Design a protein around this nucleic acid. Structure first.
Lengths: 37, 174, 215, 143
RNA sequence: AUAUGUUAAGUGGAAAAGGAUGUGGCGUUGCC
RNA sequence: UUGGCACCUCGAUGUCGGCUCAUCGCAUCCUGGGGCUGUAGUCGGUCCCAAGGGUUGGGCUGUUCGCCCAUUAAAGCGGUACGCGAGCUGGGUUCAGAACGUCGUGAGACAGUUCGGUCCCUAUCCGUCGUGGGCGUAGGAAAUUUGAGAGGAGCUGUCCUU
RNA sequence: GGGAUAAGUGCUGAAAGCAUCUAAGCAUGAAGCCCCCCUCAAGAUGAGAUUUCCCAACUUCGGUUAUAAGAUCCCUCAAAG
């Protein structure tokens, strides 16, 4: 995953959520995983 | 919401006792299925029940839609079983049984042991096929994920343990 | 098995049954009795007091420790025993000894080869940091006035103090030390000795406590 | 000229007992400290203790509002270089709750020769039963 | 202490570009 | 780090580097746990958690730096008056002598170089390392113990087999 | 070897008819955290516990005495210093 201070979608299958206070993007492409909103 | 404002429709074959705060559903193949619920407002009837949220907020809608789903799940637990099938891809991947334990010969330098527990049954259709049958979705899911996590599917040739169909990735090493 | 109390006699060597050479410590264990049996109800822990060597009887005017006094003399007599020097408590046993005296014999260590040995003395006087802590000496090439001195004892100004646990001179040795995983070589009745494989803490005629290995 | 000053002969101290079940830590602690300092007595003299004795039963039921079982760490140094140990306020309750309440309450008593003699009248037990039945402890209700 | 709201981070009880289905208000439109 | 200000010290705060002896931070070098890979495997890259222990011996130089030889699981980066001279050395530099290149008419100066050269102290009080004596612990004594708390240790390789 | 966890991985689950490791609930997961291993430790003034030993004469003092159990002075020494 990518820990970056600006998480945002990269394609159309990626969608944004919040876990434990962290903003995250989860996708069906494992390249597109991000956290630390 | 809609999912919480839905009828449960107790099939009248299973008996749901509403012991104050707690619910206990019995059926032809499961007893003592009592769950800790919250302070919701539901009717204690047979042949159908409903759950009602007392207030309206952002903390009543969530628990409403969750309480309805949990009561539905434990009703269908005695209405029928939830079966999760785990498959084994790869050469020489065989699942042996012994008493109420499952031995997995899965390419390691030793077998792997999976002990059964209450209310659940293991069953091996063929050496590469394992089925866990139970009454709670939570328990069946815990068992299936613990049996799956021994060798999850590789992306290249797919050998490992997997659920159903083809949902895996695919790579190309060479 | 059960712990025993003993005296260090000296080191020697025997020849193992394929030709090996085995350093050995000879430990005599005699006169061991069970003087008290502490239990959870009377005292919080469960343990057994054993009593090592035999003291002489009570004397009206005794100017040494050779003769038992009235308190000690009364504590042994409740077990139906003879005054004993070196009373010690063994925990982590199974209480099937008797609070009334029963002989603890070396023959209980036939079963149980790996033991640990607690000794209670080493013995050295006030010592410097090179001896006491294994520090390093200064050079003699240049005209160094520093050789066996301790060295810097801290930082300057920002610390403004010495920390607890600094290494300095003081009385060395004499502590309590346990050597773990020692092995019984052979027990001997009619002399009441145990041959331990290695070396135990303390000087000769010292007290050693043998017990079965906690590992 | 005319201000009454309490003397050891005049002082009559009573025994109370409080239930620390279903209460908050700091809200119970401030009131128990006001009871221990003796600011609840018309005959209050600053130089000598006129306070009462307190027995705090059911210490294992004090609760914390919010996410305080994992936060609210307690730190302490041993005076040797490096050693600063810690324990969360949730692991201290399940292990040694009677220290939790005791330290909480004694942090509200002045640190003076008399601020210790006033703080050693507090008896905290985790569980409904206390040995001090021979002192006739009245049952005080916090407000 | 009294009355009406805000928030849930212990913010309160240090700090920016920028990122986000955190929650409250008013307003304004497009399909019901 | 190179600086900028000129706020404490000129009835005086000893300057390098190394030795001896440590302590702390994490922005992690090794070891441990993982996500992605343009990850087939053995090796790698790059991010996230993590400070428990460990982190070499020589040649050249006053060397801190640096380059090289042979290793190592690895040869981390920083703070503590660039830690440390009431602990040590004193090579360098900032003493006096004397010589070279250059500058000055000159006495003499360095953009530099070279040979040499007295480093003081019987520790009060706090601090630290050991050891005793007084009193207390509601009679006076002998032994054996619980453990609130505190300290210590904590590293890794290489072969054989599956 | 035991317990609770970080990053990570999840099971059921709604808010949001689907989806979702999270909001409720239930797991799993580090040489690191608390135990387990070794030493100190009741001046821990909160001064703990157990076993044993000693326990009458004189007063109106209401207290005193010496002596009992025990320990030192003094002397011969070492495993200690």
């Amino acid at each position: 995953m990518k820990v970056r201070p600006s998480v945002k979608p990269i394609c159309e299958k990626c969608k944004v959520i919040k876990r434990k206070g962290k903003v995250m993007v989860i996708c069906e492409n494992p390249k597109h995983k991000q956290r630390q909103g | 919401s809609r999912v919480g404002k839905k009828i449960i429709d107790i099939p009248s074959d299973v008996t749901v006792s509403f012991d104050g705060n707690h619910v206990t559903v019995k059926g032809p193949k499961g007893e003592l299925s009592r769950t800790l619920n919250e302070r919701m407002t539901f009717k204690q009837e047979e042949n159908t029940i409903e759950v009602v949220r007392p207030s309206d907020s952002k903390e009543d809608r969530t628990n409403h839609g969750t309480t309805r789903a949990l009561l539905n799940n434990m009703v269908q637990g005695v209405s029928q079983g939830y079966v999760k099938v785990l498959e084994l891809v790869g050469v020489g991947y065989r699942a042996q049984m012994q008493g109420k334990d499952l031995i997995l010969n899965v390419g390691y330098s030793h077998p792997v042991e999976i002990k059964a527990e209450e209310n659940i049954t293991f069953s091996v259709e063929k050496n590469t096929v394992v089925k866990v049958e139970g009454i709670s979705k939570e328990q069946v899911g815990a068992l299936a994920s613990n049996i799956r996590s021994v060798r999850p599917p590789e992306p290249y040739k797919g050998k490992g343990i997997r659920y159903q169909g083809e949902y895996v990735r695919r790579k190309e090493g060479k | 098995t059960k712990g025993i109390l003993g005296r260090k006699i000296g080191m020697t060597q025997v020849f193992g049954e394929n030709g090996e050479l085995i350093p050995v410590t000879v430990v005599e264990a005699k006169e061991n009795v069970v003087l008290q049996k502490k239990t959870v109800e009377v005292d919080g822990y469960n343990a057994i007091q054993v009593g090592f060597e035999d003291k002489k009887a009570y004397k009206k005017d005794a100017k040494s420790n050779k003769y038992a006094n009235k308190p000690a003399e009364g504590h042994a007599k409740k077990a139906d025993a003879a005054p004993k020097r070196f009373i010690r408590e063994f925990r982590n046993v199974d209480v099937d000894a008797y609070e009334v005296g029963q002989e603890v014999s070396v023959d209980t260590f036939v079963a149980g080869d790996v033991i640990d040995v607690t000794g209670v003395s080493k013995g050295k006087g006030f010592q410097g940091a090179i001896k006491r802590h294994g520090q390093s000496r200064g050079p003699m090439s240049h005209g160094s006035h520093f050789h066996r001195a301790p060295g810097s004892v801290g930082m300057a100004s920002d610390a403004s103090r010495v920390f607890k646990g600094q290494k300095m001179p003081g009385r060395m040795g004499g502590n309590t030390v346990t050597v773990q995983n020692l092995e019984v070589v052979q027990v001997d009745t009619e002399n009441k000795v145990i041959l331990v494989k290695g070396n135990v803490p303390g000087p000769k005629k010292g007290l050693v406590e043998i017990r079965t290995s906690i590992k | 000229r005319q201000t009454f000053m309490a003397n050891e002969s005049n002082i009559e101290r009573k025994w109370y007992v409080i239930d620390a079940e279903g209460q908050t830590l700091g809200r119970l602690s401030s009131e128990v400290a006001s009871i221990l300092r003796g600011k609840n007595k018309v005959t209050y003299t600053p130089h000598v203790d006129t306070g009462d004795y307190v027995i705090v039963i059911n210490a294992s039921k004090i609760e914390f509002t919010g996410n305080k079982e994992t936060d609210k760490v307690y730190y302490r140094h041993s005076n040797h270089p490096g050693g600063i140990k810690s324990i969360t306020a949730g692991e201290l309750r399940r292990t040694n709750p009677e220290r939790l309440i005791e330290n909480s309450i004694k942090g509200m008593l002045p640190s003076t020769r008399l601020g210790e003699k006033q703080g050693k009248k507090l008896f905290v037990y985790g569980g409904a039963e206390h040995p001090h039945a021979a002192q006739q402890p009245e049952n005080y209700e916090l407000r």
